[PDB]
């Protein structure tokens with residue numbers, strides 16, 4: 433519907449100030465069509481919002497385009513992804529390339545051990561720049577999930593084709609997309625229905 437569109441909207445939490453956001457709608461989630469995945473300009477995580485019911489969203493507008501519209505071997509690979517720090521020095525995070533992003537062609541879904549939520553980057557550009565090291569190599573979708581150890585509910589929204597024990601989860605209480613490999617320790621408190 434609004435998938436593939438660029439959007440703008442206000443955001444307000446509680447009595448806080450309204451901030452303005454511009455982004456690109458990537459996906460309307462099949463198991464919950466209220467849920468949209470959005471890439472905001474300049475922000476590297478993928479966000480999920482239930483736009484038709486989230487009272488924090490105001491003044492939702494579709495923007496006009498005004499401009500008219502293979503490294504798939506990276507998919508599934510463990511990588512080391514370098515980036516810049518305040519001090520001028522580079523650091524790196526290690527992670528896994530999950531998939532090509534929808535809608536924004538040249539972009540890839542990736543997640544990281546240090547922050548296992550969904551990110552989206554132009555990985556082939558970063559590779560050409562020397563900032564992406566590829567390491568040598570080497571349904572539950574729609575179910576409810578709960579985390580208790582802390583009692584958090586959500587839904588399994590995607591399975592990663594390249595690594596089928598890996599799933600994307602949307603928790604009811606947050607707008608990040610959480611990524612889990614269900615055989616690992618990070619997933620050991622997740623239970624499904």
Ligand SMILES: NC1=Nc2cc(OCCCN3Cc4ccccc4C3)c(OCC3CC3)cc2C12CCCC2
Nearest residue numbers: 476513514515516517524525544551553554557558
């Ligand atoms: N072409 C790029 N490749 C990047 C790779 C990055 O990091 C790859 C690992 C993930 N980040 C590590 C990190 C550390 C602290 C907080 C959040 C994160 C997320 C990246 O990180 C953001 C900067 C602040 C560090 C930014 C870029 C750009 C996007 C546009 C500017 C350059």
Ligand SMILES: [Cl-]
Nearest residue numbers: 616617618619
């Ligand atoms: Cl651990």
